[PDB]
Amino acid sequence: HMTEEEVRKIMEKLKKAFKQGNPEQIVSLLSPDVKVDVGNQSFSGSEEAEKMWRKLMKFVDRVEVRDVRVFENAVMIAVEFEVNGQRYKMIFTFYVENGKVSMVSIYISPTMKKLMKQIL
Amino acid sequence: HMTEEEVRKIMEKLKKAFKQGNPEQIVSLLSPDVKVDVGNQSFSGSEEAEKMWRKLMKFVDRVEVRDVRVFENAVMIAVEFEVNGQRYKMIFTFYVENGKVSMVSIYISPTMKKLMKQILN
Ligand SMILES: [Cl-]
Ligand SMILES: [Cl-]
Numbered sequence: 001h002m003t004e005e006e007v008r009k010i011m012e013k014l015k016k017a018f019k020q021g022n023p024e025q026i027v028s029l030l031s032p033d034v035k036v037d038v039g040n041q042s043f044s045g046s047e048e049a050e051k052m053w054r055k056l057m058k059f060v061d062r063v064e065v066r067d068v069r070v071f072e073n074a075v076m077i078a079v080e081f082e083v084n085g086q087r088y089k090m091i092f093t094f095y096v097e098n099g100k101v102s103m104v105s106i107y108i109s110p111t112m113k114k115l116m117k118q119i120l
Numbered sequence: 121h122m123t124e125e126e127v128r129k130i131m132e133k134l135k136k137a138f139k140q141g142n143p144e145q146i147v148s149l150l151s152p153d154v155k156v157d158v159g160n161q162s163f164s165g166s167e168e169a170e171k172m173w174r175k176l177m178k179f180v181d182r183v184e185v186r187d188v189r190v191f192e193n194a195v196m197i198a199v200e201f202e203v204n205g206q207r208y209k210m211i212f213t214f215y216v217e218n219g220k221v222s223m224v225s226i227y228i229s230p231t232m233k234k235l236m237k238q239i240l241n
Contacts, residue, residue: 035160037157037162037225040155042157042162044160067191067192069189069191071187071189071191071196071198071211072186072187072198072209072211073211073227074196074211074213074227076191076194076196078191078192091191091192091193091194091215093194093213093225095211095227097230103227105157105213105225107193107194107215107223109121110217
């Protein structure tokens with residue numbers, strides 16, 4: 001259980017990590033047993049989460065935080081990604097437990113899934 | 121891509137099915153290829169989703185909606201379930217595509233983890 005102010009803190013740090021593009025910042029906010037579900041792929045590790053993040057960031061030329069909201073212990077972040085001149089929209093949901101993200105839920109538009117399945 | 125007004129209609133239908141009892145409304149909102157992620161388990165297809173949903177709702181003796189919120193194509197519902205005298209907080213995130221729910225993400229309390237394991241297994 002975390003206070004409203006507690007969740008807002010991680011939110012601002014998650015927001016700063018996305019915009020500035022520092023991957024180490026993102027990873028430090030994840031719990032060691034963080035569960036990441038995105039599309040058909042699922043990841044159990046925190047170190048595995050970092051691997052998939054960097055594997056995505058190596059194709060992304062431009063990151064842009066569109067909007068950020070906080071619902072209970074969830075932090076939602078709308079992100080636009082530019083890959084090969086093309087823009088894509090992703091939705092991230094970070095569920096926080098004890099000051100760190102315990103679960104990450106990412107929505108992927110059908111056209112994005114193609115790219116993820118292509119540029120894999 | 122769906123308009124803000126189109127996502128709100130689904131939200132109200134979702135909100136209504138929670139403020140009321142029947143899960144028969146939520147299954148009608150599900151896409152045939154819907155993906156439900158609860159705990160470490162994932163459920164694919166409306167058939168498996170309607171099964172998992174029904175089994176869970178049969179364990180719940182009381183439902184209270186704490187809050188509802190819309191964010192892009194995502195519908196968030198904060199709920200309190202009561203199973204065997206004990207009460208648990210949960211969050212439902214419904215991702216909408218073309219008027220139906222393509223993906224459902226369910227967060228549960230750590231204290232509900234063992235209990236959720238018994239129901240689904
Ligand atoms: Cl997109
Ligand atoms: Cl907008």
